[model samples]
Target: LPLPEVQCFVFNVEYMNCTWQSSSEPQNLTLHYWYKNSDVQKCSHYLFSEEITSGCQLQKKEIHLYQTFVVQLQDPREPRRQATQMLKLQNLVIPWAPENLTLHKLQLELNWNNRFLNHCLEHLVQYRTDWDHSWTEQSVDYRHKFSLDGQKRYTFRVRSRFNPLCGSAQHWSEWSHPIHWGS
Candidate 1:
């Protein structure tokens, strides 16, 4: 029997949400997890899609940064067939995307509502003209300012993640809604 694949993301350093994809829809699927010096607990708040088990929502109190977080998934019928995943809370952090993006001529500015300290986050700005096939990406600090070309019709979006100064998160938040500039 094959086990489900699990993925987790810590949102804004506040809460966690984990989802699993299984080839077989195993009824009565269960999820249990634990952190350093914490007792293993079963997921109470389960997420479902199309009447199938999909994920779980965890509160801030259940998250322990800088410690190893372990998750186990199994079917009650056959406990021997299970899947496990280990993660560091910091590395799983994905801040909400930057918002309120505005373009003033060739200058652009945006804002992000993040709970992490200002210095703890970094943003990636992506933009491209209608004629361009790919986006141009730039890494920036909390200050959201960019220079663009007024000659082209451009579309822009931004996403954020924890910076090395605070955590080693590799996941970026979903991109902000796209904003367009120029004609």
Candidate 2:
């Protein structure tokens, strides 16, 4: 029961990562999970260089989007000393970076596609000129077009998140692939 502070990430629709602190040395540990009353399944994990047993990569086929999951860690000999967590897949989606970036017209405008997030998500847009290292960030609505000052061959990136108060997801997605545009 000592294992605690379990954290998970929905890296994207295709994968997930989770980590937890194991109080005891690595000897016998069995991890199991069932997604929202689905069949019970065993999961594998690897220890990082820092010696924490982490990185449980939940592939797309094994997960159900917008569903709840119950994961447990058990030591067969000590059923009383186990750790468990309840996760709703929706709460962890860190969405993939945006693709098919398009900057059109003489004005500074941009757009992209991600069917998984058609709408209901907030986006963080960041931009900077090639010569500068600092970035300027702005929030944008999902599926909407955004305007900038235009020109200058600036580098741009975007990431998404569900407003904590409005959606189940609590984390921001990774910054999308950076693109360079010149008006």
Candidate 3:
């Protein structure tokens, strides 16, 4: 069995963080980044450089508002004309508090690591004004902008497409379990 030489981990941008021991074997790592499981909107593929692959960085170029709930990395690489027993995008989760979380005039703000965000789930921020499901979709930028300030408590999560490396198909990445924070 072959594996990718890459590993991913998430940490709360709070003070310096620690790196977890790599457990999954990642080979030919195929990262599903951005919003939705659609690879239609993303940077072209290229060899990993010294700086870092796009998937390993925080990016929100196209999205105007979005909050990252989860970042996943999998090494589901399969050999040419091979079976489904190759490598799997081992389900991993590393949540971060994100750097510079802010809020202003009914908006949330923050930034995320593009390297971890998976497309397909349509990275979304779900907030409740009350409890009657008055959820609102913050613009991609706004999503990471106006984090819950003070009086209002905000809960956010992330979603994306989920599929194996066997084929170019996938379902929405599972919404992050959800994080609760008060303003």
Candidate 4:
């Protein structure tokens, strides 16, 4: 049988969640994980989808960034059917979406709270005018200032990811709630 597809993501440097899916028959799957010098542990919290064991959640205390994190998924009835994955926790971080987004005149500012040190995240701002079907996107240190046409309606949103200078993250947070300007 082919190995199940598994994915893991760390949220705001606070916790980790992992989920798996198999193309074959539904089976009760158990997850085991460990990192660095830690002992192997069974997943303490499980997340289900359609009554199937599909995911695991790990607390902050269980995460070890920059170190190897290993996961094993197995079928209790078939010991021979199992899958293993090894990864660095740092690379899995997906920051919380930028919040409190505000536009003062044409200047845009937003706030996000995460455990990563300052300068560790890169933010992206996306905006589009009422007449446009595609968004104009830009990278900002944390805040942005826009030069706009007062005659057009504009919608904006923001998202973030780990800065490559601090650590490499494979995913970006979901876009923030949208804010609009003009009529």
Name the best candidate (by lDDT). 1
Candidate 4 Cα errors over 4 Å, as ranges? 37-39, 106-118, 131-133, 142-149
lDDT of 2 by residue, 11-110 (tens): 6566767666665455445678886744477775454635545536677777786567888876677888887789777777776667788787666787
Quantify all predictions' global Cα lDDT against the true fold: 0.78, 0.70, 0.35, 0.76
Whichever of 3 and 4 has more lDDT, that candidate is: 4
**Residue 173 of model 2: what lDDT?**
70
Off by over 4 Å in 1: 25-27, 103-117, 128-134, 147-155, 180-183
Tens-digit lDDT string for candidate 3 (62-146): 2222222222344444434221221222222223323232344445443333333333213445556434366665534312333
Lowest summed lDDT over 10 consecutive residues: which window, candidate 3? 10-19
Residue 106's C-alpha lDDT in candidate 4?
A: 34
Those runs of model 2 whose alpha carbons end farther than 4 Å from true positions after fitting are: 22-28, 36-39, 44-55, 129-134, 149-153, 162-166
TM-score of each: 0.76, 0.73, 0.29, 0.81
Q: Rank by lDDT, highest first.
A: 1, 4, 2, 3
State each model's C-alpha RMSD to the native: 3.3, 3.9, 13.4, 3.0
Clashing pairs in 4: none
Best by TM-score: 4
* Residues 54-109, model 1: lDDT tens digits: 88889988888888889998877888988888887887888887766666642455
87-144 per-residue lDDT for model 4 (tens digits): 8777788888767666766354444444444367777778889899998897877433
Candidate number that wins on TM-score, 1 or 3: 1
Give the lowest summed-lDDT range of ten residues in model 2.
46-55
